Amino acid sequence: GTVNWSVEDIVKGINSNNLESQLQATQAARKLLSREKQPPIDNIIRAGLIPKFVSFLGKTDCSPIQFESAWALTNIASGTSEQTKAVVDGGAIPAFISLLASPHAHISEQAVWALGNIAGDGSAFRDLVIKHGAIDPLLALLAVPDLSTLACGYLRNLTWTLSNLCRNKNPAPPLDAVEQILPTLVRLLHHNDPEVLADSCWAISYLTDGPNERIEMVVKKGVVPQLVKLLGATELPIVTPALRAIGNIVTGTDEQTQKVIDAGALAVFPSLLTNPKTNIQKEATWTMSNITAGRQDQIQQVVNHGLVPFLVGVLSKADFKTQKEAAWAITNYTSGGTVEQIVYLVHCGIIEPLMNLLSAKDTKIIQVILDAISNIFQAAEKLGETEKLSIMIEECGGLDKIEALQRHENESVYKASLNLIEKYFSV
Amino acid sequence: PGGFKRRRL
Amino acid sequence: FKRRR
Ligand code: NA
Ligand code: NA
């Protein structure tokens, strides 16, 4: 019927002055643009159909051609920034915003999707969609007593569009826009659908990836507790965006980081630091390094939750990048920790793994390791046990590693390397 | 990550 | 010592 139409035939039918013939050609185009592979987006654009599709968006009398052109334009806008730009250049943004108020829910949902594709292109298209006034109508669609009264697909699409309105930086979404959507995003973050929960966590992760003022707007909304609950989830698609948002919040103030700790976050890291997904281990280890850069009571919280042996494990065996984050966590712990905490680290077995990572090619990981070694040695001086730490480093072979670091390409590496060798390994 | 844009069907 | 994305 309308399958496998030539763009020429689609152009012939759309250029008819027969609304029904245009609907047939607009549906044939949607099918071409909805096929499994190689949607001829460029061919559709060059035929000059985007303007016709945007004009069809306004056919209140022909809701079919409104839905057909919505889908075609959605899939065009799904492509490169060039093709999205073509859709936006056709005056599609205001037309889709108008369709958001359609009584046909599939037409409304298609407009939601199209706006999601536009806004997801980048920060400029995101702010342009916002300026055209899409937040009010989009949030009006979710103004129900129970979101469970909404179609699973409808809800998922609205959440994914809202996540795209909270995504992208340079600049971050307008503060007013984030404050107008944050309340509805918190309700979707408490929804029961795994896809709505992951997209909501990804929206919250986008909002928390910026200055401490942004982190505060989200933390003030009181989402950290549900984020920690979603951090425990069995779905990696939900645990991934949850850990990122928690990590983003622990990049902020020590009070924002203490809000995470109070919510029970540290109790999930035993699993996140042993998680089979390398990306989860890395991000958890980077959240731990930012937690050990905090106050001493916060380091003591880390210690009380048994997380130091887990950092030792990660430093002993884990993806190099995870190990680099772990070396950072150790250097932060030892820079800000009490002498009692620093000694707890060496009792947990941090010396051998740390000294074994000194044989790494990365120069920055060696500088970070040498930094922690010096901080622990400084704590050892306070106890008069530096000799025992020197004996521990010489036994694990790390003394040889430092000795060789004295000929390293970097100045700081051999500079700090020679200092410790002529400070705790000299007569 | 990779869902910035979505194509229907 | 806090490092951001
Ligand atoms: Na301790
Ligand atoms: Na010691």
Rounded distance between C-alpha atoms, residue A49 and residue A159, angstroms: 29
Among partner residues A247, A286, A335, which is closest to C1 by beta-carbon distance?
A: A335
A192 exposure class (CB count in 10 Å sphere: 0-12, 13-18, 19+): exposed
As a whole number of angstroms, the distance between CA A277 and CA A173 comes to: 31
Half-sphere exposure (CA, 13 Å, Cβ side) for A22?
A: 22
> In whole angstroms, what is the distance from residue A116 CA to residue A187 CA?
19
Note whether A71 and A30 are within 8 A (CB).
Answer: yes
**Residue A214 and residue A208 in contact, taking contact as beta carbons nearer than 8 Å:** yes
A68 to chain B: closest CA residue: B8
- C2 contacts A336? CB cut-off 8 A: no
SS3 call for A150: coil
Residues of A in contact with C3 (CB under 8 A): 251, 286, 289-290, 293, 328
Measured CA distances, A187 to A147, A249, A256 (Å) = 8, 19, 21
In chain C, the N- to C-terminal Cα span, in Å, equals: 13
Structure token digits, residue B6: 């979505």
- Residue range of the domain that includes A25: 1-427
Q: Give how far Cα A21 sits from Cα of A13, A236, A353, A357, Å.
A: 6, 47, 72, 70
Residue A5 CB neighbours (<10 A): 19
Name residues 1-9 of chain B within 8 A of A (Cβ).
3-9
Contact C5 A251 (CB under 8 A): yes
**Phi, psi angle pair for A266, to nearest 5°:** -55, -25
* Residue A134 Cα to ligand 2 middle (Å): 61
| A251 reaches C (C-beta below 8 A) | yes
Long-range CB pairs of A30-36 (<8 Å, 24+ gap) are A30/A68, A30/A69, A30/A71, A30/A72, A30/A75, A31/A2, A31/A3, A31/A4, A31/A5, A32/A4, A32/A5, A32/A7, A33/A71, A33/A72, A33/A75, A33/A76, A33/B7, A34/A71, A34/A75, A34/B7, A34/B8, A34/B9, A35/B9
Residue type, A391: I
Cα–Cα dist A165/A160, whole Å: 9
Is A6 within 8 Å of chain B by CB? Answer: no
Which 8-state DSSP code applies to residue A407?
A: T
Which string of b and e fits A227-260 if b means at least 16 CB within 10 Å? bbbbbebeeeebbbbbbbbbbbbbbbbbebbbbb
Residue type, A390: S
Of all residues in chain A, the one with the smallest CA distance to C2 is: A290
Nearest CA-CA distance, residue C4 and chain A, Å: 6
Give the whole-angstrom CA distance, residue A92 versus residue A109: 15
A90 and chain B: CB distance < 8 Å anywhere? no
Q: What is the CA radius of gyration of chain C?
A: 5
Q: Which tokens sit at A197?
A: 């929960």
Contact in structure between A98 and A58 (CB atoms under 8 Å): yes
Cross-chain Cβ contact A335/C5 below 8 Å: no
Structure tokens at A123: 């920060």
DSSP state of A232: T
What distance in Å separates residue A161's CA from the closest CA in chain B? 9
Contact yes or no for A253/A214 (Cβ under 8 A): no
d(CA A217, CA A243): 18
Around A254, how many Cα atoms within 13 Å sit in the side-chain half-sphere? Answer: 11
What's the CA-to-centroid distance between A271 and ligand 2, angstroms? 29
Alpha carbon separation from A102 to A22, A58, A148 (Å, rounded):
21, 11, 21
Task: Tell me how far the alpha carbon of residue A291 lies from the centroid of ligand 2, in angstroms.
Answer: 24
Q: How far does residue A342's CA lie from ligand 2's centre (Å)?
A: 8
CA distance A377 to A267: 30
Number of domains in chain A: 1
Q: How far apart are the first and last CA of chain A?
A: 91
Alpha carbons A68 and A76: distance in angstroms, whole number? 12
In a mutational test of the C interface, the residue from A169, A290, A291 whose CB has the highest number of chain C CBs within 10 Å is: A290
